[PDB]
């Protein structure tokens, strides 16, 4: 397993883009050697406008490699108009610089269909139940999912969301999994599965409620 220095550049999450209205993009560089020098990581915009102060972050990994990230805030309108942002990575040990670019993404648009389910009780799990959410037939593939219980949004660490996979049609689908406790559904037996997607009209939101005991 040789370690190859690779770079990645994400798009803003629909949540940061449409809800918090604080969109950001992140340049991720992996498989760096700690004992080697540090990388120079710079940004550029197609419009020629200046870029904002990005926030840099480095992390030692268990597999003995270094991970460098740079997060850049972008204008909401700028991004949506269809601006192109670029990240460039240089290292004296790297033969050739790395460059990745990101943009709005174009193509057909379809709002997501949301379905929420609760698992029946299992022998053993007296006080645990699992909630699941199917979100499908949306495009493009960018989508954000949150879980709300008692009108407050749960921490992102409480639930797991799969990556977008292609349907047999043209759209995409994702699954979301949320483990809940008796204390929670007894306080209030309503859990909201919310999806944020650019094609959802209006306010880029679609959601469904589910109950353990209906």
């Amino acid at each position, epitope marked *: 397993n040789p370690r190859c220095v690779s770079a990645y550049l994400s798009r803003p999450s629909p949540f940061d883009l449409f809800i918090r209205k604080s969109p950001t993009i992140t340049c991720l560089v992996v498989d760096l050697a700690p004992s080697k020098g540090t990388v120079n990581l*710079t940004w*550029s*915009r*197609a*419009s*020629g*406008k200046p870029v904002n102060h990005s926030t840099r972050k480095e992390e030692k990994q268990r597999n003995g490699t270094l991970t460098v990230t740079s997060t850049l805030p972008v204008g909401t309108r700028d991004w949506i*108009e269809g*601006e*192109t942002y*670029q990240c*460039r990575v*240089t290292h004296p040990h790297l033969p050739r*610089a790395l*460059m990745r670019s990101t*943009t709005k993404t174009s193509g057909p648009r379809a709002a997501p269909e949301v379905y929420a389910f609760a698992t029946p009780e299992w022998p053993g799990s007296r006080d645990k139940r699992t909630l699941a959410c199917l979100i499908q037939n949306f495009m493009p593939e960018d989508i954000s999912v949150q879980w709300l219980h008692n009108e407050v949004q749960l921490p992102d660490a409480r639930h797991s969301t799969t990556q977008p996979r292609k349907t047999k049609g043209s759209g995409f689908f994702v699954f979301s999994r949320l483990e809940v406790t008796r204390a929670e559904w007894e306080q209030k037996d309503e859990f909201i599965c919310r999806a944020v997607h650019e094609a959802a009209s209006p306010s880029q939101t679609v959601q469904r409620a589910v109950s353990v005991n209906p």
Partner: antibody
Amino acid sequence: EVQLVESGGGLVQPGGSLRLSCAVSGYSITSGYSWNWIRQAPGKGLEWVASITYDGSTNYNPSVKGRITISRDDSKNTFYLQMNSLRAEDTAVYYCARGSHYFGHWHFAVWGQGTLVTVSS
Amino acid sequence: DIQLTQSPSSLSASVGDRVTITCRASQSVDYDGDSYMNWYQQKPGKAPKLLIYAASYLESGVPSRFSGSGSGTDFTLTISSLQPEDFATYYCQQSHEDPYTFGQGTKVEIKR
């Protein structure tokens, strides 16, 4: 998507003047990018003529500088090329193009169809 | 001014063949870890289309069979598998120093 359409071409008398206009749609010429004029005389290669960036900074090719002006009209989302003292060698297809930025330098990512300027008596 | 020379001036190649176009600059177009040479494609009756910018980066929507390489004063455009629609004149262009300048062009004809 961005579209660029040139107009003002056609016949011009030798020693006469020229006014070309590039109508831009889909994007605002004050919002960003560079905006250039490039010409191509018959059976010959491409010559960059002039440019104006979104903040108004202008630049010209010394080959034709001094009898040339580039300018814009924000309300019309249009920019212009003005040339005087035309000669037969100025006969060419004139393209307008939007330059995209890459770490201090521009490249012409979007072009119009170009318009033919014919200098003849 | 930075002068650009292309070779060959003209070539004829069959569908599926590899085509190689060279661009030489009178001075280096390197700056800050990148080489600022651009490649354009001009089909008949149409305006030039950007294929590659900054030596090796492919413009969006451009077929992958187009690729660029080189640095300093030596640059190469490669068409890995020639197609009938690739019939065009190809231009290199430096954006490192004003005035921006183009090569004289390379005519690519299809042998059939």
